[PDB]
């Protein structure tokens, strides 16, 4: 009756970006990234793999409001080091970890 | 850049007054018999039983940087380092003083009277302990 | 009927049909025309 | 071998118990829900009822069929009819099925086996009424008396558990770690003795007890996780893990693509 | 009112188990065990059939 | 009944449910309702731009 | 020193068990396990054999009723503490009407609460009849998939509840 | 369909409406896999005092696992201590309680929860039968003020 | 019936057919979600709006003029949990300490020095909760046995807007006089304090969301030996009654001045049964450790009190109507299942059982007649007070 159409939790509508990055004035070298159409599934995963990279000085996230499947992530790192890269790497590291996993899950499997 | 306290005490007793993971201990000084110490502590993180020889130190110095300082200074040559603030300066008769120290939720009490020019009235205060 | 409403209204209603136990209750219902009557007496046991 | 490591446990056709070690909890949980909610499947979405003398109403039946598990082997090579440049739907983007059931023998039953697959499969095992039943006719839809008819026509589509529950192939998933509370990420309730009053978990048999004389290890983090992935059929439990890893990747892909588009 | 495809609580199918159940009753005289063998472990999927009230039967005795 | 208190227009009523992520003074309103109640706001060369979007 | 006789039409009455001291070898309920297993034998005979009597509110005044048939003719420190006989109570859980009759363990809730459910029950959804598919009545609701409760009262057995959850 | 507003209740005066609706992931769960369909607040217990609810839950958590029909009838010879032992014979905690992992992070809950199957009636009084909003609509005749009831706008 | 029964709120359009209101503003209207409906009115002039924000704004209403104290505090979950979250035993690590500051809209953007650095760097609730409290907020308490080193972690001391020691609950964040709310309005202003809520909320709820919390029958059972220790306090009390009934069926008792021998008979039974139940529960009260959830919800101050627990785990108590123990509707007796002139407690309405044990028929009945009285006026004083009110207004 008043509930949106289910498929609005992942499909982006007419000109709208998945990612929105804003600079932080509060402190030097900091940003707040607005993620569209997402949740804890992908969020918490990025947050985690950042406290592994001892080059990240800060990494938190939050859900503005539960009705809308979105979330803001605020990250702050050391001097002259762009977070995006550490995000790429650790994200790639996930894929590598997963590439390995996949493989390691295939050989393991085969022995049945 | 100097020290403001150095003394080994002895656990008079350990109290776990309704705390499954924290115990409040008390102990007198080995030097003067006027300096007492009351301090709450994480019995889970740092176990301690009655009759122990601990060395307490203090002072304020060596956003909040994460670790990384492994190849930087490290005045952490100890095994317990809390941060907090001090509030009151009480005088129990004579010229004996006694400051009350709370660490963001963790209380502490010092007593004696010989820091009439050592223990300041600022917020700063870092606790240290060893062995 | 007539210009004689000087009767009692409540008697005979529109049998509930929300749930079975609802309908049941309704037939097994008693009324009582009007601080003491409302009390739950012993005799009700 | 090295960094992350897999350790499959007892696995069958409709389950895959297993141990995932050398990984952060964060990522286990992440993967957890991805199977539960974001794995492509295939369920009926549009129903063009032709005849129905059943005691059940139209949309009552429509619901039922939505949950029934269909094949999803080559499910990954299809597009949503909405994205398909064909007005509405078609073989190149949808799968149509028929169903007619007339009551003649004056109680006739309607099992899912009576469904044909009139539309074009694009030549790939998929869109088939997954039967694991011994005879060949899983899930009895309904019964009917004397002269009651029933003519349907189902159309199936992609979709995921997010869009609707009628999709997810998971259906319950076990997850536990550190059965003997050593990390103390919990404070057990009790009246006298915790150990005796608190049931030992069947996973407690794969790890050594605490052992008192040892102090509390603190620098330790949540490593090794005992799971179990139940399946309903449609996709082999293994793919139901791979595709997840992959869908997550596909997401992780755009996460890297969209990234560039912001450079 | 007929059996519920997939259990609300967890999701596991439960459409097929109907005829199987009503048989393991009539003859083999089981409950607990039947279920256990039907592969219905945890109470979540369990409660669905054992709590199902097949109304449809009386409805089917109706004309149209 | 009708004078010391009367039924009035521009009013609505529904079912309440609390939200722990709404500022103290806020009040989440159901889309349906927002699409029903209006407010006479005069046209001004400062909000025309915003109004011209809203009107289309 | 008086005798009240009422034949009247409109007198509420309940049924009770008869005790009678017919034991010339000690001090016991007239009913036996033979009447039981025997259950041309209606309820009218169960009365035509002097095994139950209809005691109205007035007559009650001058009688003494025993609660539990058994007991009223060491312990576990967990269970509930329990505290000439002329009549016995068929069963205490029969003093309830439709509403409370469906409430599990009403003797464990604050009584005024039971009184609430006693009303809300008359406002839930389910199935109110089976002919429903042939009724042209204004307003009516049927719960998609019903479900008989996981816990029940022996009395429910007479409220056909299992067939109409 | 039940909506984020429809009213519900058990058989213990524990009436309540929907505040939100989560899915399987977001939902808390137990090692076994088993996940809840409903989550009501512990605060609705202390002053309501309705304890049988908690009991109805336990009993019903046994008949579920044991497959045997659960008798709840009034004054019989069944106690919480008795039931608790039977539930210990089957495998799960003697009081019902189970461990749960927060559906968002996967990390365990520092506490334990009273997880157990309880009967729930879906009382009528669903939102879309109450939701009403008007701005200058059908006016009454005698008064000329608006009209009564949401049904007549 | 309140000045606060109507307040201006900021509109936030959201989906789904329902009015979404904040939790803390529940008690002013005195509403719940068990089906309650709410009326909404929509302003129409340019001035009307100003009038709505300058006189009816929620922040201005924070302080109720009738009792020169607030009328909105922290309820249920948020209250209940903030207590836990506050305890010395409550520690939080970086990973969570990050997601918590982020959740605070007002965060100054400065991470406070960890209360621990030594092996693993942890924090405590008391700490983070303070980041929601603005600078310059000075609070001093002192309860009963309260002195600069609170053993049981009692009292409350906040300087510069940072928690030093003590637990936070009903007493410290309730609609009370000293109330931390009352002070932030007065010291900082309406706006900031109205915002203060949202922060304190988001933070607590989040923590609880991860720490979890529940309640179940287990939180209502008394020790194995305690259930015995109580029994003989009811047995002895029964005889301590039988004694004074014997000592009454002998005229060996005096009429408490101003009262009738019958009234004076009453006067003792009541003070005997009451005091019994009163300690009966108190025996369990101190027998329920500081982890028992039901207890927690009593210390937190978020629902129920001693009495409640008592009536659920020990003895419900004696029932009564019109001030006197169950009358004699049946000539010279409570029920026909009793010997006439039976003055004992099982007849005059004394439920010796606990809800946990499941009351006897008789007891179950009496109990209702007592409750029955409640509902009566609750369906009369509800509008008769309103009647009495209407006059006062008019
Ligand atoms: Zn198409
Ligand atoms: Zn299930």
Alpha-carbon distances of D58 from A5, B120, D30, G25, I273, rounded to whole Å: 22, 82, 38, 74, 64
Select the residue from C13, C19, C42 to test the G interface by mutation, using most G Cβ atoms within 10 A: C19
H104 to chain A, any CB pair closer than 8 A? The answer is yes
Substitution target from E2, E3, E41 for chain D, most D beta carbons within 10 A: E2
Residue D217, chain B, CB below 8 Å: the answer is no
Question: How many D×I Cβ pairs under 8 Å?
Answer: 10
Q: State which residues form the domain around D31.
A: 3-40+166-263
Residue H100 to residues A109, E40, H29, H97, H107: CA-CA distances in angstroms?
30, 21, 5, 10, 9
Q: Per the annotation, does D81 bind a ligand? A: yes
The residue of F31, F34, F36 whose CB has the most chain A CBs within 10 angstroms, and thus the best one to mutate to test that interface, is F31
Q: Indicate the burial class of H148 (C-beta count within 10 angstroms; 0-12, 13-18, 19 or more).
A: exposed
Interface of A with D (CB under 8 A): 6-7, 9-10, 17-19, 21, 40-42, 44-45, 47-49, 52, 84, 88, 91-92, 94-95, 97-98, 100-102, 104-105, 108-109, 112
Question: Distance from CA of residue G74 to its chain's centroid?
Answer: 31
The total number of residues shown for chain E amounts to 64
Q: Which domains are delineated in chain E?
A: 1-64 (1.10.10.60)
Inspect the interface and report whether the beta carbons of E46 and H64 lie closer than 8 Å: yes
With H, G, I as helix, E, B as strand and everything else as coil, classify residue I40: strand
Measured between CB atoms, which of I11, I16, I33 is closest to F27?
A: I11
Angle at D122 between CA D121 and CA D124, to 5 degrees: 70
Q: For residue A58, what is the enclosing H or E element?
A: strand A56-62
Q: Which residues contact H25 (CB under 8 A, 6 or more apart)?
A: A40, A41, D32, D33, D36, D37, H103
Q: Residue A96's domain is classified under what CATH number?
A: 3.30.1360.10
- Assess whether chains E and C touch, using the rule of 3 or more C-beta pairs within 8 angstroms: no
Q: Which of F26, F27, F39 has the CB atom closest to I44's CB atom?
A: F39
| Tokens matching residue B62 | 């060596």
- Residues of H in Cβ contact (< 8 Å) with D203: 31
Distance CA H7, CA H15 (A): 7
Report the SS3 class of residue A22. Answer: strand
Judging contacts by C-beta atoms under 8 Å, the chain G residues touching residue I359 are 80, 107-108
User: Residue ranges of E for the binding site?
Assistant: 7, 10, 44-45
CA dihedral C14, C17, C19, C24 (to 10 degrees): 60
A1, A41, A66 ranked by CB distance to H3: nearest:
A1
Count of CB atoms within 10 A of residue F56's CB? 5
Among H38, H43, H60, the residue to mutate for chain I (most I Cβ within 10 A): H43
Chain I residues inside the 8 Å CB shell of H127: 17-18
Q: Which residues constitute the domain of residue A14? A: 1-112
Distance CA D21, CA I380 (A): 66
D221 and chain I in contact, CB less than 8 A: no
Q: Alpha-carbon distance H77 to H138, whole Å?
A: 63
Q: Are G64 and G98 in contact (CB under 8 A)?
A: no
**Cα I383 from chain centroid (whole Å):** 25
Residues tagged in the binding site annotation of E for Zn(2+): 7, 10, 44-45
Distance CA D188, CA D181 (A): 9
Question: How many beta-carbon contacts under 8 Å exist across D and H?
Answer: 72
Instruction: Please report residues of H whose CB lies closer than 8 A to that of A3.
Output: 3-4
Q: How many CB pairs under 8 A join C and I?
A: 20
D203 and D257 fall within a common domain: yes
Say whether residue I70 is in contact with chain B using an 8 A CB cutoff. no
CA distance C38 to chain G (A): 14
Give the alpha-carbon dihedral of H82, H88, H92, H96, to 10 degrees: 20
CATH of the domain at B83: 2.40.50.140
D92 alpha carbon, closest ligand: 1
Query: Distance from the CA of D89 to the center of ligand 1, in angstroms?
Result: 3
Taking the CA of residue H15 and the nearest CA in chain D, the distance in Å comes to 27
Q: How many structural domains does chain A have?
A: 1
Q: What is the D92 CA–ligand 1 centroid distance (Å)?
A: 7
Beta-carbon separation of D188 and H110 below 8 A: no
Other Cβ atoms within 10 Å of G95 Cβ, number? 17
Instruction: Note whether A5 contacts F: Cβ–Cβ < 8 A.
Output: no
Helices (H) and strands (E) counted in chain G, each on its own, are 5, 5
Residues D115 and D55 in one domain: yes
Strands D154-157 and D43-47: antiparallel
Asked if residue D35 and residue D102 are part of one domain, the reply reads no
Given a contact cutoff of 8 angstroms between Cβ atoms, the answer to whether I80 and I298 are in contact is no
The minimal CB distance from D24 to the residues A10, A17, A48 is found for: A48
DSSP per-residue letters across H21-32: ---TTTS-B-TT
Q: Could you tell me the strand order of the sheet in which B53-57 lies?
A: B85-91, B97-103, B106-110, B36-41, B23-29, B6-15, B53-57, B128-130
> What experimental approach yielded this model?
X-ray
I234 touches chain H (CB under 8 A): no
* Partner-chain contact F28 I31, CB within 8 Å: no
Query: Helix (H, G, I), strand (E, B), or coil: what is residue B115?
Result: coil
Helix, coil or strand: residue D110? strand
Q: Which residues surround ligand 2, an ion (CB under 5 A)?
A: E 7, 9-10, 44-45
Cβ neighbours around D49 below 10 Å, total: 15
Tell me how many domains chain B contains.
Answer: 1
Q: Which residues form the domain of I143? A: 78-211
CB nearest H104 (choices: A1, A3, A40) = A40
Q: Give the count of beta carbons closer than 10 Å to the beta carbon of residue A41.
A: 23
Q: How far apart are CA E11 and CA E13, in angstroms?
A: 6
Give the residue from A12, I378, B54 showing the smallest Cα distance to G116: I378
| CB contact A74 to I (< 8 Å) | yes
Overall domain count for chain D = 2
Which residue from H13, H51, H70 is facing G152, i.e. has the nearest CB? Answer: H70
Compute the distance from residue G162 Cα to the ligand 2 centre, in Å.
Answer: 21
- Answer for the pair D132, D69: CB distance below 8 angstroms, yes or no: no
Are H33 and E42 inside 8 Å of each other by CB? yes
The verdict on D93 and D117 lying in the same domain is yes
Q: Decide: helix, strand or coil at residue I176.
A: coil
Q: Is D215 on the interface with B (CB under 8 A)?
A: yes
Q: Which of D4, D38, D256 sits opposite A88 (nearest CB)?
A: D256
Helical (H) or strand (E) element with F54: helix F48-55
- The beta-carbon neighbor of B64 closest among I113, I119, I159 is I113
Residues D222, H36: Cα–Cα separation, whole Å:
25
Directed axis angle between helix I261-285 and helix I226-246, to 10°?
A: 170
Chain H: closest CA distance from residue F31 (Å): 12
Give the residue among D32, D4, D8 at the shortest CA–CA distance from D19: D8
Closest residue in I to G57 (Cα–Cα) = I330
Asked if D155 contacts D46 with a C-beta cutoff of 8 angstroms, the reply is yes
Contact E43 H67 (CB under 8 A): no
Q: Do G99 and C28 touch (CB under 8 A)?
A: no
Q: What is the CATH number of the domain that holds D34?
A: 3.30.1360.10
Ligand nearest to the CA of E6: 2
Reported residue count of chain G is: 165
Chain D residues close to E62, C-beta within 8 Å:
55, 145
- Nearest by Cα to D22 from D47, D49, D2: D2
Residues D125, D137 within the same domain: yes
Q: Which of E31, D197, I371, D28 is nearest to A41 (CA)?
A: D28
Q: Which of residues 59-98 of A touch F (CB under 8 A)?
A: 64-66
Closest partner CB to E43 (pick from H24, H65, H68): H65
Q: State the distance between the two ends of chain D, measured CA to CA, in whole angstroms.
A: 38
* Whether residue D122 sits in one domain with residue D133: yes
């Amino acid at each position: 009756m008043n509930a949106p159409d289910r498929f609005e939790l992942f499909i982006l509508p007419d000109d709208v970006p998945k990612l929105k990055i804003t600079p932080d004035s509060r402190v030097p070298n900091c940003i707040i990234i607005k993620f569209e159409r997402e949740d804890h599934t992908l969020a918490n995963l990025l947050r985690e793999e950042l406290a592994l990279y001892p080059d990240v000085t800060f990494v938190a996230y939050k859900v503005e409001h539960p009705l809308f499947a979105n979330f803001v992530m605020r990250l702050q790192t050391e001097e002259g080091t762009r977070p995006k890269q550490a995000l790429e790497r650790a994200c790639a590291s996930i894929i590598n970890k997963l590439k390995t996993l996949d493989h390691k899950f295939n050989e393991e499997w085969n022995i049945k | 850049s100097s020290a403001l306290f150095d003394d080994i005490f002895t656990v008079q007793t350990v109290d776990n007054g309704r705390y499954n993971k924290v115990s409040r201990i008390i102990g007198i000084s080995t030097t003067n018999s006027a300096i007492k110490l009351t301090l709450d502590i994480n019995n889970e993180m740092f176990p301690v039983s009655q009759d122990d020889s601990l060395t307490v130190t203090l002072a304020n110095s060596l956003s909040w940087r994460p670790p990384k300082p492994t190849d930087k200074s490290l005045a952490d040559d100890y095994d317990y380092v809390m941060f907090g603030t001090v509030y009151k300066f009480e005088e129990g008769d004579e010229d004996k003083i006694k400051v009350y120290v709370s660490f963001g939720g963790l209380l502490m009490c010092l007593e004696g009277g010989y820091k009439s020019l050592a223990s300041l009235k600022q917020d700063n205060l870092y606790i240290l302990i060893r062995r | 009927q007539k210009k004689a409403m000087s009767s009692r209204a409540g008697v005979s209603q529109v049998l509930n049909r929300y749930t079975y136990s609802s309908t049941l209750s309704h037939l097994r219902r008693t009324n009582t025309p009007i601080a003491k009557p409302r009390q739950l007496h012993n005799t009700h046991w | 071998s090295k960094e992350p490591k897999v350790n499959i446990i007892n696995a069958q056709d409709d389950e895959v118990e297993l141990m995932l070690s050398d990984v952060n909890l964060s990522l286990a949980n992440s993967l957890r829900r991805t199977m539960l909610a974001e794995v492509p499947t295939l369920a009926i979405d549009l129903v063009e009822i032709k005849m129905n003398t059943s005691v059940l109403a139209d949309e009552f039946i429509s619901h039922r069929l939505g949950l029934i598990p269909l094949v999803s082997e080559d499910v990954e090579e299809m597009k949503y009819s909405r994205d398909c440049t064909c007005e509405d739907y078609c073989d190149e983007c949808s799968v149509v099925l028929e169903l007619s059931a007339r009551h003649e023998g004056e109680t006739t039953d309607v099992y899912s086996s009576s469904l044909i697959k009139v539309s074009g499969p694009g030549n790939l095992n998929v869109g088939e009424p997954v039967r694991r039943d011994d005879y060949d006719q899983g899930i009895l839809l309904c019964k009917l008396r004397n002269h009651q008819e029933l003519n349907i026509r189902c159309i199936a589509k992609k979709g995921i558990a997010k869009e609707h529950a009628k999709w997810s192939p998971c259906s319950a998933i076990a997850f536990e770690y550190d059965p003997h509370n050593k990390l103390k990420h919990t404070d057990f309730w009790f009246e006298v003795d915790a150990k005796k009053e608190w049931p030992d978990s069947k996973y407690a048999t794969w790890e050594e007890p605490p052992k008192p004389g040892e102090v509390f290890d603190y620098k330790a983090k949540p490593n090794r996780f005992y799971m179990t992935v139940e399946t309903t059929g449609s996709l082999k439990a293994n793919q139901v893990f791979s595709r997840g890893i992959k869908t997550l990747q596909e997401k992780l892909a755009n996460v890297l693509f969209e990234l560039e588009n912001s450079r | 009112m007929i059996i519920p495809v997939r259990c609300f609580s967890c999701g596991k199918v439960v459409g097929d188990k109907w005829d199987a159940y009503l048989r393991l009753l009539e003859e083999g005289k089981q409950e607990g065990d039947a279920l256990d063998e039907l592969k219905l472990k945890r109470y979540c999927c369990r409660r669905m059939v054992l709590t199902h009230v097949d109304l449809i039967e009386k409805f089917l005795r109706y004309n149209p | 009944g009708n004078l010391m208190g009367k039924r009035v227009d521009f009013s609505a009523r529904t079912v309440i449910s609390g939200d722990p992520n709404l500022e103290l003074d806020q009040v989440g309103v159901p889309i349906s309702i927002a699409k029903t109640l209006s407010y006479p706001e005069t046209v001004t060369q400062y909000n025309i731009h915003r109004l011209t979007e809203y009107v289309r | 020193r008086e005798f009240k006789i009422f034949t009247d039409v409109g007198r509420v009455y309940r049924p009770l068990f008869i005790v009678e001291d017919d034991e010339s070898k000690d001090n016991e309920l007239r009913i036996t396990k033979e009447h039981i297993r025997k259950i041309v034998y209606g309820w009218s005979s169960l009365v035509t054999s002097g095994v139950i009597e209809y005691v109205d509110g007035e007559e009650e005044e001058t009688i003494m009723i025993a609660m539990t048939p058994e007991d009223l003719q060491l312990n576990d420190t967990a269970k509930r503490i329990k505290p000439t006989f002329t009549h016995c109570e068929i069963h205490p859980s029969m003093i309830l009407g439709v509403a409370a009759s469906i409430i599990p363990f009403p003797d464990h809730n604050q009584s005024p609460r039971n009184t609430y459910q006693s009303a809300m029950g008359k406002q839930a959804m389910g199935v109110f009849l089976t002919n429903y598919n042939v009724r042209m009545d204004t307003m009516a609701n049927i719960l998609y998939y019903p479900q008989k409760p996981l816990a029940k009262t022996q009395a429910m057995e007479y409220l056909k509840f299992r067939e109409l959850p | 369909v039940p909506q984020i507003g429809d009213k519900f209740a058990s058989r213990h005066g524990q009436k309540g409406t929907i505040g939100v609706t989560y899915r399987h992931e977001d939902m808390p769960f137990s090692a076994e896999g088993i996940v809840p369909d409903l989550i009501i607040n512990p605060h609705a217990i202390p002053s309501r005092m309705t304890v049988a609810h908690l009991i109805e839950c336990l009993l019903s958590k046994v008949g579920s696992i044991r497959g045997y029909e659960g008798d709840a009838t009034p004054f019989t010879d069944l106690t919480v201590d008795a039931v608790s032992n039977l539930l210990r014979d089957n495998g799960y905690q003697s009081r019902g309680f189970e461990v749960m992992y927060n559906g968002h992070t996967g990390k365990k809950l520092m506490a334990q929860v009273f997880f157990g199957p309880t009967y729930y009636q879906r009382l009528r009084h669903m939102v879309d039968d109450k939701i009403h909003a008007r701005a200058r609509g059908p006016v009454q005749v005698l008064t000329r003020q608006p009209v009564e009831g949401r049904s007549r706008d | 019936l309140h000045k606060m029964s109507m307040m201006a709120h900021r509109v936030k359009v959201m989906p789904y057919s329902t009015f979404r209101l904040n939790l803390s503003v529940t008690s002013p209207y005195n509403a719940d979600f068990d089906g309650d409906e709410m009326n909404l009115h929509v302003p129409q002039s340019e001035e009307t709006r100003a009038e709505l924000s300058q006189l009816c704004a929620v922040p201005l209403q924070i302080v109720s003029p009738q009792s020169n104290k607030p009328v909105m505090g922290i309820v249920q979950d948020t209250l209940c949990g903030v207590r836990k979250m506050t305890l010395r035993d409550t520690f939080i690590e970086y990973e969570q300490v990050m997601n918590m500051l982020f959740w605070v809209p007002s965060w100054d953007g400065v991470v406070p020095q960890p209360a621990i650095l030594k092996p693993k760097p942890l924090w405590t609730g008391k700490q983070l909760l303070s980041i929601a409290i603005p600078s310059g907020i000075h609070l001093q308490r002192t309860d009963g046995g309260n002195s600069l080193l609170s053993p049981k972690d009692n009292g409350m001391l906040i300087v510069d807007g940072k928690v030093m020691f003590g637990v936070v609950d009903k007493k410290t964040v309730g609609s009370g006089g000293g109330g931390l709310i009352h002070t932030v309005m007065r010291e900082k202003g309406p706006k900031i304090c109205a915002e203060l809520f949202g922060n304190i909320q988001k933070v607590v709820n989040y923590w609880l969301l991860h720490n979890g919390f529940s309640i179940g029958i287990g939180d209502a059972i008394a020790d194995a030996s305690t259930m015995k220790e109580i029994t003989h306090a009811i047995s002895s009390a029964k005889e301590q009654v039988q004694e004074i009934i014997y000592k009454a069926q002998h005229n060996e008792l005096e009429l408490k001045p101003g009262m009738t021998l019958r009234e004076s008979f009453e006067g003792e039974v009541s003070r005997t049964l009451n005091d019994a139940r009163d300690s009966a529960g108190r025996s369990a009260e101190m027998n329920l450790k500081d982890l028992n959830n039901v207890k927690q919800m009593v210390s937190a101050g978020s629902k129920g009190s001693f009495i409640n627990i008592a009536q659920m785990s020990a003895c419900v108590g004696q029932q009564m109507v019109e001030g006197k123990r169950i009358a004699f509707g049946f000539a010279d007796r409570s029920l026909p299942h009793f010997t006439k002139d039976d003055f004992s407690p099982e007849s005059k309405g004394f439920v010796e059982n606990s809800y946990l044990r499941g009351l006897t028929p008789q007891e179950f009945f009496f109990h209702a007649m007592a409750g029955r009285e409640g509902l009566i006026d609750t369906a009369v004083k509800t509008a008769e007070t309103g009647y009495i009110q209407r006059r006062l207004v008019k």
